[PDB]
Amino acid sequence: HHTMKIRSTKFSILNSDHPRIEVKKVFSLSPDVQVTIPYRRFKGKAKVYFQNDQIQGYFSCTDRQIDEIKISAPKNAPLLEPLLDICYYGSFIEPGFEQTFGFYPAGKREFVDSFFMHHSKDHKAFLIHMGLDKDLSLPLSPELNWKEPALSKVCRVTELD
Secondary structure, three states, X not given: OOOEEEXXXXXXXXXXXXXXXXEOOEEEEEOOXXXXXXXXXXXXXXXXXXXXXXXXXXXXXXXXXXEEEEEEOOXXXXXXXXXXXXXXXXXXXXXXXXXXXXXXXOOHHHHHHHHXXXXXXXXXXXXXXXXXXXXXXXXXXXXXXXXOOOOOEEOOEEEOO
C-alpha cells in the first residue's frame, strides 16, 4: 500500500514530481565478480511525511538533497536513528548507495546493514549534508538531540507548525 517503512519509521509521500525511481548500481572487482545493489531515490521535488513513535514531521527534497526538515518531538529526544531512516529513504548521504564502505560489498542485505552501522557510529555525513549554523535559536543540536543546548546547530531543521 501507500505507506512505506524503513526500520521503525513510516514514510508517506504527500506530493512529488515523479514516482520514486530505481538505480541498478553495480559494484565490480572483475568481469566475473560483481554485485548488483539497487537503491531508490526521487527525481525532482518531493514532500514526504514521516513518523516514528513519538516523533513525526515532514521533509522536502530535490533529487538527492534535503531542502528542509520540520519535526515534532519530545524535549531531549535522541533523533539519530530516525534521521538515518530518512537519509536511507532518499539516499541522501554516502557511503551506502554509490560508494562502498571501504570494502567490496557481499550483497544487498549486507549493504543496508552496513549503512546504519557505519553512520550511527559516525554521523558527520549528515551534518555535512545539512550544514552547521551559528544561530542557536534552531532546535537540533549537532549530536542530533532535540532542543539540546549547544554552541552551534544543524541547518534547515526546524519545528513543525
